């Protein structure tokens, strides 16, 4: 039953001082630092996760470190809005513009009548 | 011969307000041409809890009148408002709960909240949970509107002062008994260092006029002068009467 | 390394499985501390629901 | 370290300038050919000793080769 010690001069069990126990080829246990759990991108409209993007730390998303396909979604507002949110936005825009046209036409017709 | 607690309050440094987790001041939009003449539309995006404040607050997003950007505001929530609702602020805004209107456009008998005192001050009256002001009458000659405040006082303000239609949300909070000291501790922890309170008669004479004596008692009338100096002005200040009604 | 054998522990485990040393005079915790009724209920619910499925 | 699954790709990798050395490990069940490049060590596993020998013969003359 080998007992371990911290590998760094951090002696407190904070969120940024998380470790895992790993067995080395030398037949002994050792600590290894593990990054804090991070939530991936979230859709502001629905509040649910954005599909197709892994949950990494902010610096792990850097272009030099992560492939473009892993941080991009091939759709309008891809990576920012969910598919349902984008569909809702498109439908709302189209219908609101149509209603604006209808209102303008109705106003013109009323003006012509009077 | 020692400074009393009430006196020490003014210096602060332990009696300052606890505002670390607050979400910023709640106020109307700055009065501008759009609100003065027509109306401007915003959308309620969130209803949030402001620590130390009973009333919930509403985040409202507006389109900037003359800049390509979003105008973000934090209003004191009126009861009945929801996320995704459209809020209309201006002189021509419709008389619906949640809309901000100039008092000149609000008919008599209307219930409003966060009423401005000076035109453009962005709201100072009737902001607490469950509170509201009532529009009494208008005077077009001097352009002044009369309102009844939550305390029952009648105040005259310029008719250009704005007010949100409806009452403040969160009413009835004070009805619930707290039942224990821990609830009060939690309540005042986010407000200020004003709890618990030690009675003056429990202190020694050196630090309170009520202190001292072989029995616990004030020893002189608890009513004090309005002009009594700090350190002597304790108890019932300038009381016109005392006791039960 | 100094000898510390597990033979006695294994023999005691065998005897306990046979049913020895399990009387009322060998129990210190309550029935609940020994085996929660919640654990028993969870086991029964899982078994019966799996059978029904 | 990276693994090359094709002898043609292994030869392409060994033909480039930055290929420093080649190490041939003789395991019981296969033969491993390791090319040391600037960035990565490329390992090719050959299950058959005949193709392993053919590869060893086909190694470029100018590349150092060592046996383990």
């Amino acid at each position: 039953v080998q007992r371990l010690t911290y590998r760094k001069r951090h002696s407190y069990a904070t969120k940024s001082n998380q470790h895992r126990v790993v067995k080395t080829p030398g037949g002994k246990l050792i600590y290894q630092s593990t990054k804090k759990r991070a939530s991936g991108p979230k859709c502001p409209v629905t509040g649910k996760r954005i599909q197709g993007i892994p949950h990494l730390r902010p610096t792990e998303y850097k272009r030099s470190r992560l492939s473009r396909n892993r941080r991009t979604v091939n759709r309008a507002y891809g990576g920012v809005l969910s598919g349902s949110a984008v569909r809702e936005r498109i439908i709302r825009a189209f219908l609101v513009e149509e209603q604006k046209i209808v209102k303008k036409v109705l106003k013109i017709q009323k003006a012509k009548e009077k | 011969g020692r400074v009393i607690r009430a006196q020490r309050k003014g210096a602060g440094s332990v009696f300052k307000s606890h505002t670390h987790h607050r979400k910023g001041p709640a106020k109307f939009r700055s009065l501008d041409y759009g609100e003065r003449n027509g109306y401007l539309k915003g959308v309620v995006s969130e209803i949030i809890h402001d620590p130390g404040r009973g009333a919930p607050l509403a985040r409202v997003t507006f389109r900037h009148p003359f800049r390509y950007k979003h105008q973000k505001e934090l209003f004191v929530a009126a009861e009945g408002m929801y996320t995704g609702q459209f809020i209309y602020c201006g002189k021509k805004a419709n008389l619906m709960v949640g809309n901000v209107l100039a008092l000149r456009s609000i008919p008599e008998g209307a219930v409003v909240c966060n009423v401005e005192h000076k035109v453009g001050d962005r709201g100072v009256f009737a902001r607490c949970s469950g509170d509201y002001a009532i529009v009494i009458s208008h005077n077009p000659d001097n352009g002044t509107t009369r309102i009844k405040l939550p305390s029952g006082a009648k105040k005259i303000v310029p008719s250009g002062c704005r007010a949100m239609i409806g009452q403040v949300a969160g009413g009835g909070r004070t009805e619930k008994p707290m039942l224990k000291a821990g609830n009060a501790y939690h309540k005042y922890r986010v407000k200020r260092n004003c709890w618990p309170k030690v009675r003056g008669v429990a202190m020694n004479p050196v630090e309170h006029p009520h202190g001292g004596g072989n029995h616990q008692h004030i020893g002189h009338a608890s009513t004090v002068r309005r002009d009594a100096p700090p350190g002597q002005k304790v108890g019932l200040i300038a009381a016109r009467r005392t006791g039960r009604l | 390394t100094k000898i510390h054998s597990r033979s006695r522990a294994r023999r005691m485990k065998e005897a306990k499985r046979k049913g020895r040393h399990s009387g009322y005079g060998k129990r210190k915790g309550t029935r609940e501390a020994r085996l929660p009724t919640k654990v028993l209920w969870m086991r029964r619910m899982r078994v019966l629901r799996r059978l029904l499925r | 370290p990276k693994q090359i699954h094709e002898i043609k790709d292994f030869l392409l990798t060994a033909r480039r300038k930055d290929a420093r050395t080649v190490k041939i490990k003789k395991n019981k069940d296969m033969v491993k050919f390791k090319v040391r490049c600037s960035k990565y060590l490329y390992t090719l596993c050959v299950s058959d000793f005949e193709k392993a020998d053919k590869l060893k013969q086909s190694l470029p003359p100018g590349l150092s080769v060592q046996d383990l």
């Binding site: - | 009452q167 009835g172 909070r173 008994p177 | - | -």
Partner: protein
């Protein structure tokens, strides 16, 4: 089985604070923890998030209401008064 004759939810307080105060707080305890009808999606899924804030788990709409109830009594009266005044102005 009828676990408590009359205490109900306030049984968590044991024998503290007095019977009158326990009975008084029972109303708030029940109301603030009950579910409420959602007018936007027609479901009984409205729950209190914090004092005055009521969110629906199904459709996600959040409303500002009473401290311990979704709708205070005075809210309906205020709505009726505002509607009457708006109708008078519009007519």
């Amino acid at each position: 089985t009828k676990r408590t004759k009359k205490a109900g939810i306030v049984g968590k307080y044991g024998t503290r604070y007095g019977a009158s105060l326990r009975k008084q707080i029972k109303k708030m305890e029940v109301s603030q923890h009950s579910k409420y009808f959602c007018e936007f999606c027609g479901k009984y899924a409205v729950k209190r998030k914090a004092v005055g804030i009521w969110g629906c788990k199904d459709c996600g709409k959040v409303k500002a209401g009473g401290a311990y109830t979704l709708n205070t009594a005075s809210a309906v009266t205020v709505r009726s008064t505002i509607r009457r005044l708006r109708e008078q102005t519009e007519s």
